[PDB]
Amino acid sequence: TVRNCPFDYAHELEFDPQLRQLLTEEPVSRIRMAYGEGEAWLVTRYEDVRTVTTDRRFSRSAVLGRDFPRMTPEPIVQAESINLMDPPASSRLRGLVAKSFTPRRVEQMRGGTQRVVDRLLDEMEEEGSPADFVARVSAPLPLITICEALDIPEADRPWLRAHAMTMMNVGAAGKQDAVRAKAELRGYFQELTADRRRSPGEDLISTLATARDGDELLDDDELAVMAMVLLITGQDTTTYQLGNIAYTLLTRPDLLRSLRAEPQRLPRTLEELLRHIPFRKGVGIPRIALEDVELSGVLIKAGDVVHVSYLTANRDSAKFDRPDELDPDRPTIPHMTFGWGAHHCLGAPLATMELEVAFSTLLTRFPALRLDVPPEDVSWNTTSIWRYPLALPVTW
Ligand code: HEM
């Protein structure tokens, strides 16, 4: 009665058939994952994911100390992270970093991001066709963006990203590498944040370090971990989504033609691309039931582990008509690709702006952009919790 879920489906950007079957046939189910102990509930329907991520009887703080069902042999989350805080404690720190991503703030960052994108595309154009869109655009843009915000020295950026990637590996033998990568990244940020708290500058880390409401909002360890979390989160999914969206556009000719004909369609089209693309393998950080709760007729016991699938929520026909169709003109309904509820993505406005600047500029600068290989020759990542193309040869 307990499903085996290695969550290793990795075929292109096709939806995981196991996740689709559970959404359809067993929407609240018991699963066993690659690592951690015991079973977990898996919640798949949009309305039920909405419940689990907002109802205060499902807790992230209670995950602390558990060897919880998960996809990587060492957990990516850290003890002091915002991910493992509950409201109202999580609200104050979420509100603090959200201040750095207000609508005025990201629109004041947009000019600088436009200049980065212009330079990346200049360099790609100078090297000449064909090129790897991953190496030239999707990999560098988010790393530059978050490292400029955190004021990270350019010389350190490859080392930081390499360590973050090690933590995302699902292979069992990589556990000790992942433990070491997490410890070395934590040490880097403990030292860096201590320096910025001691001697503040005008960067984001200094802003977080000096924030007070009587006491400092972040103690020394919370500050170190928050800077580390912002680096890690800022440079993975946005890189992978730039690549996933590029592949999708370059293999959907009517959709790409529509964006070339009417570029003002891009913001709404990007929202539908985000809803549709299965950008991760499996499921992420669970929650713990704090007491017995009957979720859509299923009794979840106090202490049980509860996982949500945002990917199945995005394909729930109860919410999205013809959910497997990529339809940029469909009625607008909030998707779950940035999560939901108390832990909704803090970087969503920044990621959205990066996607809009990159693709709006790409589409006008390279009107003959095409994939330079048959789509089936594109290789897709198997080693990570994320889904992404390893390389994307393009011509123009
Ligand atoms: C297309 C790009 C992105 C996607 C699809 C994405 C998606 C997500 C998802 C699914 C979650 C988890 C929600 C949960 O735990 O239930 C999350 C959380 C988070 N994201 Fe993102 N994200 C993106 C970009 C970013 C960026 C650029 C940043 C930082 C600059 C960022 C920072 C965070 C943080 C700090 C959290 C944890 C929030 C909390 O637990 O309170 N994300 N994101």
Three-state SS sequence of the chain: CCEEECCCCCCCCCCCHHHHHHHHHCCEEEEEECECCCCEEEECCHHHHHHHHHCCCEECHHHCCCCCCECCCCCCCCCCCHHHCCCCHHHHHHHHHHHHHCHHHHHHHHHHHHHHHHHHHHHHHHHCCCEEHHHHHHCHHHHHHHHHHHCCCHHHHHHHHHHHHHHCECCHHHHHHHHHHHHHHHHHHHHHHHHHHHCCCCCHHHHHHHCEECEECCCHHHHHHHHHHHHHHHHCHHHHHHHHHHHHHHCCHHHHHHHHHCHHHHHHHHHHHHHHCCCECCCCCCEEECCCEEECCEEECCCCEEEECHHHHCCCCCCCCCCCCCCCCCCCCCCCCCCCHHHCCCCHHHHHHHHHHHHHHHHHHCCCCEECCCHHHCCECCCECECCECCCEEEC
**Both tokens of residue 331?**
């009625």
**Both tokens of residue 329?**
């003109």
Distance 366 CA to ligand 1 centre (A): 30
Distance 61 CA to ligand 1 centre (A): 18
Distance 233 CA to ligand 1 centre (A): 6
Cβ–Cβ < 8 Å for 392, 379? no
- Ligand 1 touching residue 243 (CB < 6 A): no
Q: Name residue 389's beta-bridge partners.
A: 380
Q: How many CA atoms, within 13 angstroms, populate the side-chain half-sphere of residue 105?
A: 12
Residue nearest to atom 17 of ligand 1 (CA): 345
- Ligand 1 touching residue 343 (CB < 6 A): yes
Cβ–Cβ < 8 Å for 167, 182? yes
Cβ–Cβ < 8 Å for 228, 218? no
CA-nearest of 93, 167, 188, 133 to 362 is 133
- Ligand 1 touching residue 230 (CB < 6 A): yes
Residue nearest to atom 8 of ligand 1 (CA): 338
Distance 348 CA to ligand 1 centre (A): 7
Cβ–Cβ < 8 Å for 263, 360? yes
Q: Ligand 1 pocket: which of 105, 345, 353, 359 to mutate (most atoms <8 Å of CB)?
A: 345
Distance CA 57, CA 74 (A): 26
- Ligand 1 touching residue 82 (CB < 6 A): yes
Residue ranges of domains in the chain = 1-396
Cβ–Cβ < 8 Å for 48, 309? no
Residues 6+ apart with CB under 8 A from 263: 360, 363, 364
Cβ–Cβ < 8 Å for 355, 238? yes
Resolution in A: 1.6
Distance 385 CA to ligand 1 centre (A): 14
Distance 66 CA to ligand 1 centre (A): 22
Atom of ligand 1 at shortest distance to CA of 354? 27
Atom of ligand 1 at shortest distance to CA of 341? 16
- Ligand 1 touching residue 338 (CB < 6 A): yes
Q: How was this structure determined?
A: X-ray
Residues 6+ apart with CB under 8 A from 25: none
Q: First-to-last CA distance in the chain?
A: 52
Which phi and psi (to 5°) does residue 130 adopt? -90, 170
Atom of ligand 1 at shortest distance to CA of 229? 35
List C-alpha distances in Å: 332 to 258, 267, 270, 327, 328: 18, 12, 12, 10, 9
305-308/40-43 β-pairing: parallel
Distance CA 31, CA 3 (A): 5
Annotated binding residues for heme b: 60, 94, 287, 310, 343, 345
Distance CA 23, CA 234 (A): 30
